[PDB]
Design a protein around this ligand. Sequence first.
Ligand SMILES: Nc1c(C(=O)N[C@@H](CC(=O)O)C(=O)O)ncn1[C@@H]1O[C@H](COP(=O)(O)O)[C@@H](O)[C@H]1O
Ligand SMILES: Nc1c(C(=O)O)ncn1[C@@H]1O[C@H](COP(=O)(O)O)[C@@H](O)[C@H]1O
Ligand SMILES: Nc1c(C(=O)O)ncn1[C@@H]1O[C@H](COP(=O)(O)O)[C@@H](O)[C@H]1O
Ligand SMILES: Nc1c(C(=O)O)ncn1[C@@H]1O[C@H](COP(=O)(O)O)[C@@H](O)[C@H]1O
Ligand SMILES: Nc1c(C(=O)O)ncn1[C@@H]1O[C@H](COP(=O)(O)O)[C@@H](O)[C@H]1O
Lengths: 212, 419, 419
Amino acid sequence: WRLWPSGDRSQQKDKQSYRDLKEVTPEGLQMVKKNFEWVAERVELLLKSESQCRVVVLMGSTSDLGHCEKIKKACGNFGIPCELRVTSAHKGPDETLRIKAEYEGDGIPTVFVAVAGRSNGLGPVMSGNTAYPVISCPPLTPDWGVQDVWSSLRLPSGLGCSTVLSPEGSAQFAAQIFGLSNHLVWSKLRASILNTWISLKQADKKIRECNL
Amino acid sequence: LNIGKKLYEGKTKEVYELLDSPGKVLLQSKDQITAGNAARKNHLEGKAAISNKITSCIFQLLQEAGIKTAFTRKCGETAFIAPQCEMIPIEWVCRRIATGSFLKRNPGVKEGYKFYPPKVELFFKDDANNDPQWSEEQLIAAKFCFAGLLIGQTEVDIMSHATQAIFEILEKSWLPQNCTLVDMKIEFGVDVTTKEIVLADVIDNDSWRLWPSGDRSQQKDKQSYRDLKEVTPEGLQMVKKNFEWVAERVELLLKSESQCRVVVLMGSTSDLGHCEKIKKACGNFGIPCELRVTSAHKGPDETLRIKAEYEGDGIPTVFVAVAGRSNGLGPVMSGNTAYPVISCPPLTPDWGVQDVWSSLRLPSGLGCSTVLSPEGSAQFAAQIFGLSNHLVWSKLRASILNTWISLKQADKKIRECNL
Amino acid sequence: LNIGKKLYEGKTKEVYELLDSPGKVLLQSKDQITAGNAARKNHLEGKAAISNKITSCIFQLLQEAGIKTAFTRKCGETAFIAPQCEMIPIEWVCRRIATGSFLKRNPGVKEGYKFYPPKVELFFKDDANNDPQWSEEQLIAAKFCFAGLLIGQTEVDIMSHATQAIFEILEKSWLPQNCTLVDMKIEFGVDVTTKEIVLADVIDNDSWRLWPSGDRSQQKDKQSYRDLKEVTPEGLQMVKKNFEWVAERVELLLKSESQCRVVVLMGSTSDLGHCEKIKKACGNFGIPCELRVTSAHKGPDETLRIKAEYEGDGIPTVFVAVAGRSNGLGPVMSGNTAYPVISCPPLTPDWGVQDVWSSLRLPSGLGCSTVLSPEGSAQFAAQIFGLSNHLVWSKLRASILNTWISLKQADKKIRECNL
Ligand SMILES: Nc1c(C(=O)N[C@@H](CC(=O)O)C(=O)O)ncn1[C@@H]1O[C@H](COP(=O)(O)O)[C@@H](O)[C@H]1O
Ligand SMILES: Nc1c(C(=O)O)ncn1[C@@H]1O[C@H](COP(=O)(O)O)[C@@H](O)[C@H]1O
Ligand SMILES: Nc1c(C(=O)O)ncn1[C@@H]1O[C@H](COP(=O)(O)O)[C@@H](O)[C@H]1O
Ligand SMILES: Nc1c(C(=O)O)ncn1[C@@H]1O[C@H](COP(=O)(O)O)[C@@H](O)[C@H]1O
Ligand SMILES: Nc1c(C(=O)O)ncn1[C@@H]1O[C@H](COP(=O)(O)O)[C@@H](O)[C@H]1O
């Protein structure tokens, strides 16, 4: 590769320092060795997380737990710790705000996922009372889903609350948010674009055989 | 081949039983041409082979379109094998252009009057009385029974509709040879095994009027012979060349004049079964159909590369986009090709009311259509190719007839449970 | 015709000012053939007229498709009038089939490799260094300015896309002559008045490779001259025959190979405005379009009679059914014709969500499609006719290009508010 500290070519740390010597002297080889050592002293830091990430899934009822386990598992695929909590905006709004505050208060950057079926008040109340992002991921079913979703979507002014229906999608959206400030999350999202694209190529190659 | 006794004997053909093949017969053409209930006749060498060649090409054409027809296979230069039928003694005439007897029975109508839709008439077979015209009322009142089928309103209606469809198919088929099919006569029979009414007898150069470039003076059919003041041995050689002209070209009606292809693009292998139904249905119309897997959302670069492979090889193509949920595949394809794109989304009642709108409400500059039925997708694609391909057109036209016959048959069945 | 000063002088043509016409010039072809940057050069009588005829037919073809082109009209046997442009000194090559310099610069690739989509390359015009290939990066870095237009990323992207579209249209247009367009070179200019990049210079038998029946040994283009070991006057006569062969056929690219017609059927005269939009939109694709009034529900006998008039006259037809509320018109038409039927219901936000399902959920055996946009329904009908008509196809292809260019131009404008 070519590696420029501060994007400055004259600070090149790669083998180009050796390619560019008019004449190889043992003084020239010592500079090239220092450049290699400089890269070697820093490369292990690419494996280090520069930012903490956390998703908190808030569920209005334990009957939605299975939907919440899918989000949590999906967060694991992106290396993002994910906590489940039970709170109802309608039956325990005092407790919703207390739980919110525990996660707001410990310094760890957090995305909230609100999982509430029927009339989702949980995402709205959370969205209105935190500066952190909130994603509604309602556990919609074809029975009443067409009716229930509008409670997540049409909110009063001053509410940033987003909606992602896929539970794996809600984790992926939360990963995309953390990927702006965490290169390890970003890299899993980028590789995942590649791998999915490769899977399509491989599936099209297979099905293309039935056309001969 | 094991020949048995002669069953029917006419002035141009003979029918024999086949002891080897139960319920099949051999129709042997003869080297004879006739005009006016055998009051004019002539030996003509090669006429048997010309007649048999034309009816064999035409019956294969009609049969492969889906018309129910008394034809098994050709059997040498001068015969063909058919299912045994009891002939219905009616001449069914269909006209696009008024000429001949239509002018004599309708003084004041001028040669060239066009019939939309094609005009159907019935004539009772009777040499003695010069084949008098019958009304449908007369034929129903005859209470004819053949192979046990009573010929009533339903059967008369079926022969009338089938006569029009057969004419249309032959008319469309001759067009690419620059020949106007003016009119024709056909006969139906009842298959002694299936009891179904089927096109029978023969269709040859005595069966129709065929004008190259729609010009009457370039007549290629038997009218060339009927019209002759005097039958000279020089006149009979001209009539012979006309029959040979038809005989050369008739085999070209079986030639596809244009290549056709459907490409079904699916965003996921989970939609494969829906895509198989489209492909099967394309097979019913004789249209090659390829399946490919590409996602406009996860691999749009590849959607365009696949599009380009099918745009680029010269084969006329219809794309069918099969994408569930938010269909982006039809839109992206529609926006990037001059070829037609059909969205056929695999809708289910769970979310289909919501999903359909992604196919329907498109930005300007998009001609993308929507067909919900997978079999319908293929049918729509056939209809587009039928504008440029007479074989596809003909399967669609015969299918209109056969569907309509099925309704008549189902109504006749259920009408019994009302007694 | 008041000629002025000689503005530019090339190896095979001269450009003159027109004192009578501000912003127009005359391109005069010469009786000269050349190849390479040594002494392969020859007088060839009739070449000026052949060159001028071909570029005049081709530019008319591309201009009438909607490709923006420096062409006003033919002006005698050997010249044509054009809007004045500042030429961009790039040779834009497009290839369907790898031959020629593509094989030299890519050793290992074999004669006949197919490009999907067609491959675009750039060569800088400079005879001194034999026209070296440039990257898009090199062209952008050159910061060329012509008639005040800086040639940046947007302009390079537009000439690249247009090169491919122009190739595709010429390729499709030669197909009905059984000729394979293998590759071509074109040049663009900036129109000094409009400031638009337009196809310019000429397109003639020096501009492309044309293989009858896709056979290289039958090459009809200037390659026949490039390939001579030695120029003899017997060699020059063969090359002249090849040029004449192209010139004798090029006018046929302007000929329609198929008739096209849309029939818009409306259940009520209150939908007429919606129907006028479809008809106008059909005009943009050069497709005649007829309006008729018929109701499936109040006059189904008449619906079928009208259908039959259009089925019966031999002209390939697409039906558009325009019926508000419960659309029975598309369904009844779809069920009774082998031709395609498109429902384009005049939906409004009052009841449109309810009314559309009458077009969409049809009994089995119905191919009927739905297109909500009235301009869309014409575009869909054009896409169907484009499978069998190169002139319609070419307008659809150019329209993809022009719409894409409009987006590029609108993004370039809005990008300024971000500085
Ligand atoms: N118009 C020209 C030119 C061209 O300008 N040639 C002159 C030479 C010169 O003027 O420098 C000549 O030799 O004819 N060279 C190729 N092409 C066309 O471009 C596509 C690419 O051809 P390749 O790059 O493979 O030679 C094919 O269609 C050629 O006919
Ligand atoms: N549904 C709610 C809630 C809530 O549920 O707390 N607060 C305001 N609203 C309603 O949203 C609309 C927009 O109001 P604002 O955007 O001005 O808050 C109003 O009709 C309001 O009653
Ligand atoms: N093949 C026969 C016979 C016959 O069997 O004598 N009579 C008429 N036709 C054909 O029927 C159409 C109508 O003929 P008319 O106009 O004489 O009724 C024509 O195509 C004719 O060849
Ligand atoms: N709507 C689209 C698109 C697209 O528009 O690009 N790609 C796939 N799909 C559809 O989404 C469903 C989920 O499929 P996957 O989750 O396996 O991609 C399928 O029915 C597919 O056709
Ligand atoms: N709506 C209509 C019409 C019509 O309107 O003519 N014909 C059949 N159908 C209905 O479509 C469904 C599919 O029926 P088929 O696909 O077997 O025709 C049935 O419930 C039928 O009554």
